[PDB]
Write a protein that binds this ligand. Structure first.
Ligand SMILES: Nc1ncnc2c1ncn2[C@@H]1O[C@H](COP(=O)(O)O)[C@@H](O)[C@H]1O
Ligand SMILES: CC(C)[C@@H](N)C(=O)O
Length: 497
């Protein structure tokens, strides 16, 4: 086969082949600064040498604390080239979380800038990375070697998820069952390196020989700045949370921007419903760009299912995550003796080459979350199979509570609220009214350009749910509060009340 993705079994071999084949093509751009594949390959070989001198060796975990930029990408390639795995430290981590991640992962070196009080002293500064830029530049990693460790909160200790070269290659090989990508695409590098969305951004581009466009620091604050850059730089593929997409849509429409240069907008990370999509579709249609809902988890290498948005999607009030990539086996499992009857809601279980080995030094947890039956991962997500095989996403599986004589599925209440045409987000929690009087309450976000009263929402819910599942109060918020890992911050919401 001529296909580099099918032919290579690790990311370093893949990158090296893509680069060597057409080394003058642009791999990475930052403003007007264009870095060719050949240049990037040599640059990262040089930085790898610097890491070798710091004792970095195959199997090592090397911390990475940098904002998404050219140097950070060079650093990633260098770490991988040393046969090591990178451990991204979110710049906006509380100091305690960073301390734990470094300790837990046994990071033996850090590249970039150490957070204040950082315990790792073996440091390759960003400046040293830049120094290597235009210089001349070991077996390299194998398929079963770790490429990165990304930590996912849930509360408890953050769980380290080691993902192998083979895991990522499985994802990259699955992508073309859904997407038409080529070396002429330009991908925006946007997400924090500590979020696995960035793994998809980086390797989506590199695996296809495309250009990775860095969002400049000046453009990092507003959707207007974001749009200016993606349009100016001829970006064809962007990746967004549904939340970010709301802001993008509003800026595009109000600013009269031309978005038709985009080929794909790819969603991940949150429940996607039609009210979040209808305004973009109204202005821009669904062809240029194509919109694709992606569902995935750190533990199964970024993405698991995709659903390309269609007119049909816009005409229904639920959330559809679509069909699983070819590597996956799936089960929808009840409590019980497991498998549910088609159409019924249960926990999604996943199998296949995209599954991580398990958590880092968490034998207890791994055994539970990665059971054998064929090895599976229990997503902790509730879904239901549609008549045609696509999955609808219901909610998280740990949201049942006990209240006033009932077991209550908070996820079902949230889903019912999300069915309202003028709601784009919602969180249901329990709070105290009178002492000894606890009740369901719902914080929600109105569709831009709409205003829905508590009374109207109560009336909406009356048609869908029994009275014991009715929120007692509603609270409109500009947006829901979010963690840096977030995603909605379910705990901060309770505080907003
Ligand atoms: N398209 C999506 N729709 C609904 N939920 C999602 C989607 N993508 C990711 N998630 C949620 O995000 C979780 C994974 O987030 P992470 O903890 O960062 O790995 C999943 O288990 C889901 O709960
Ligand atoms: C970023 C999305 C695709 C998923 N991997 C997540 O962790 O939220």
């Amino acid at each position: 086969t001529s296909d580099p993705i099918a032919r290579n079994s690790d990311l370093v071999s893949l990158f090296r082949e893509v680069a060597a084949t057409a080394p003058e093509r642009t791999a990475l751009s930052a403003e007007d600064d264009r870095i060719s594949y050949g240049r990037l390959d040599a640059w990262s070989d040089a930085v790898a040498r610097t890491l070798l001198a710091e004792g970095v060796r195959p199997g090592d975990r090397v911390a990475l604390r940098m904002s998404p930029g050219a140097e950070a990408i060079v650093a990633i390639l260098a770490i991988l080239k040393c046969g090591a795995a990178y451990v991204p430290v979110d710049l906006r981590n509380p100091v305690s979380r960073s301390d734990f991640i470094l300790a837990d992962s046994g990071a033996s070196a850090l590249i970039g800038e150490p957070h204040e009080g950082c315990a790792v002293t073996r440091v390759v500064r960003t400046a040293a990375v830049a120094e290597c830029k235009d210089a001349e530049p070991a077996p390299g990693p194998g398929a079963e070697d770790m490429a990165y460790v990304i930590y996912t909160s849930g509360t408890g200790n953050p769980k380290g998820v080691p993902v192998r070269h083979a895991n990522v290659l499985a994802l990259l090989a699955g992508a073309p069952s859904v997407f038409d990508f080529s070396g002429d695409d330009r991908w925006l590098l946007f997400h924090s390196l500590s979020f696995d969305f960035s793994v998809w951004e980086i390797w989506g581009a590199f695996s296809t020989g495309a250009e990775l466009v860095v969002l400049p620091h000046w453009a990092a604050r507003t959707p207007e700045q974001y749009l200016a850059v993606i349009i100016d730089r001829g970006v064809t593929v962007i990746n967004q949370t549904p939340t970010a997409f709301l802001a993008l849509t509003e800026a595009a429409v109000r600013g009269g921007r031309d978005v038709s240069g985009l080929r794909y907008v790819i969603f991940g990370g949150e429940k996607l419903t039609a009210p979040m999509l209808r305004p973009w579709a109204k202005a821009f249609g669904l062809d240029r760009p194509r919109l694709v809902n992606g569902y995935g988890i750190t533990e199964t290498t970024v993405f698991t299912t995709f659903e390309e948005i269609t007119e049909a999607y816009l005409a229904q009030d639920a959330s559809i995550i679509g069909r699983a990539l070819p590597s996956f086996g799936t089960r929808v499992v009840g409590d019980d003796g497991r498998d549910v009857a088609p159409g019924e809601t249960g926990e999604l279980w996943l199998s296949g080459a995209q599954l991580a080995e398990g958590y880092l030094r968490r034998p207890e947890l791994t055994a539970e979350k990665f059971p054998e039956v064929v090895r599976y991962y229990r997503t902790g997500d509730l879904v239901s199979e549609l008549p045609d095989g696509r999955f609808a996403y219901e909610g998280r599986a740990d949201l049942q509570i006990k209240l006033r004589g009932y077991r209550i599925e908070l996820s079902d209440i949230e889903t019912a609220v999300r069915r309202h045409d003028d709601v784009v987000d919602a969180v249901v929690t329990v709070r105290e009214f009178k002492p000894g009087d606890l009740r369901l309450v719902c914080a929600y976000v109105a569709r831009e350009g709409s205003a829905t009263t508590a009374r109207e929402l109560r009336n909406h819910i009356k048609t869908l749910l029994p009275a014991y599942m009715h929120p007692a109060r509603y609270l409109p918020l500009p947006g829901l509060p979010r963690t840096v890992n977030g995603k909605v911050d379910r705990a901060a919401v309770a505080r907003s009340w």
